[PDB]
Amino acid sequence: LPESFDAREQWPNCPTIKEIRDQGSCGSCWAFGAVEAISDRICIHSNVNVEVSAEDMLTCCGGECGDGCNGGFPSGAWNFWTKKGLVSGGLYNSHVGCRPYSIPPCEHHVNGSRPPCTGEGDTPKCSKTCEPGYSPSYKEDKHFGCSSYSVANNEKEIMAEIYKNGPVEGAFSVYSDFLLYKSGVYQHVSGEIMGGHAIRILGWGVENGTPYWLVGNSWNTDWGDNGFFKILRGQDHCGIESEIVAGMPCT
Numbered sequence: 001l002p003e004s005f006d007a008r009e010q011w012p013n014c015p016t017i018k019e020i021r022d023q024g025s026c027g028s029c030w031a032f033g034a035v036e037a038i039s040d041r042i043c044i045h046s047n048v049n050v051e052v053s054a055e056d057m058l059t060c061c062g063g064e065c066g067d068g069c070n071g072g073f074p075s076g077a078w079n080f081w082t083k084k085g086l087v088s089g090g091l092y093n094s095h096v097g098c099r100p101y102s103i104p105p106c107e108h109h110v111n112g113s114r115p116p117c118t119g120e121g122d123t124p125k126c127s128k129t130c131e132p133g134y135s136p137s138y139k140e141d142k143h144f145g146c147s148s149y150s151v152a153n154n155e156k157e158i159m160a161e162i163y164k165n166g167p168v169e170g171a172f173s174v175y176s177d178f179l180l181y182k183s184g185v186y187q188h189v190s191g192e193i194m195g196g197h198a199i200r201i202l203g204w205g206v207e208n209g210t211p212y213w214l215v216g217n218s219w220n221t222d223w224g225d226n227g228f229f230k231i232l233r234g235q236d237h238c239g240i241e242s243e244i245v246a247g248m249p250c251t
């Protein structure tokens with residue numbers, strides 16, 4: 001395996017890999033890390049390009065994935081992709097795809113032109129229909145996964161999975177000092193525990209002798225390093241290597 005790897009550079013024909021979404025004022029990171037990595041993989045393993053709907057995952061999976069905007073289970077999200085499939089759906093107000101995200105973007109621990117994010121956000125309804133004007137139907141727009149698995153808490157196995165099959169979804173414990181991340185390799189030193197946070201791991205590298213994971217957050221582009229961040233790799237730091245999940249698209 002190479003010393004560094006950036007899925008963005010390795011799969012140039014898959015622009016979703018470079019995208020950063022905004023989960024809005026809703027605890028839907030579990031769903032976002034999933035649809036983001038799924039969008040990347042559909043492109044990687046089908047050379048088709050599709051913005052997988054965070055809305056479809058968030059609203060229609062149900063108990064199998066947890067509790068919507070109240071948090072969920074990453075592995076459960078990939079299961080939904082294989083069982084019910086996922087329709088397309090772009091950013092809030094984009095009118096792209098069957099079911100675009102319905103929760104407005106906001107400022108995540110940063111100042112900006114958008115309204116500040118709030119904790120209170122209700123899970124939207126599971127509507128099995130597409131926005132007006134979009135074709136095909138909701139049912140016909142479903143994209144299915146043909147496998148859903150969990151990668152072991154093993155640095156090398158995780159790197160190999162990304163190297164071969166593309167970005168994966170992971171999760172780590174967020175402490176308050178992470179909220180102010182701007183650059184460099186994040187290492188937890190202080191702050192009260194905020195809770196688990198699901199994200200998308202798309203690569204790895206070494207910065208100033210410090211090995212790290214290249215990660216895409218779902219708090220828009222004005223948070224962190226253009227929406228991305230790097231976190232210590234190899235020591236299951238904050239559990240970053242303890243909850244890796246992925247899957248492969250059908251055909």
Ligand SMILES: *[C@]1(C(=O)N[C@H](C(=O)N[C@H](C(=O)O)[C@@H](C)CC)[C@@H](C)O)O[C@@H]1C(=O)OCC
Nearest residue numbers: 026027028029030071072108117195196198
């Ligand atoms: C994962 C999750 O969504 N994380 C939360 C989050 O992103 N909070 C944002 C924020 O801090 O900007 C606000 C705007 C929404 C409440 C927090 C807990 O980090 O609860 C979600 C989940 O499914 O966790 C299990 C992996």
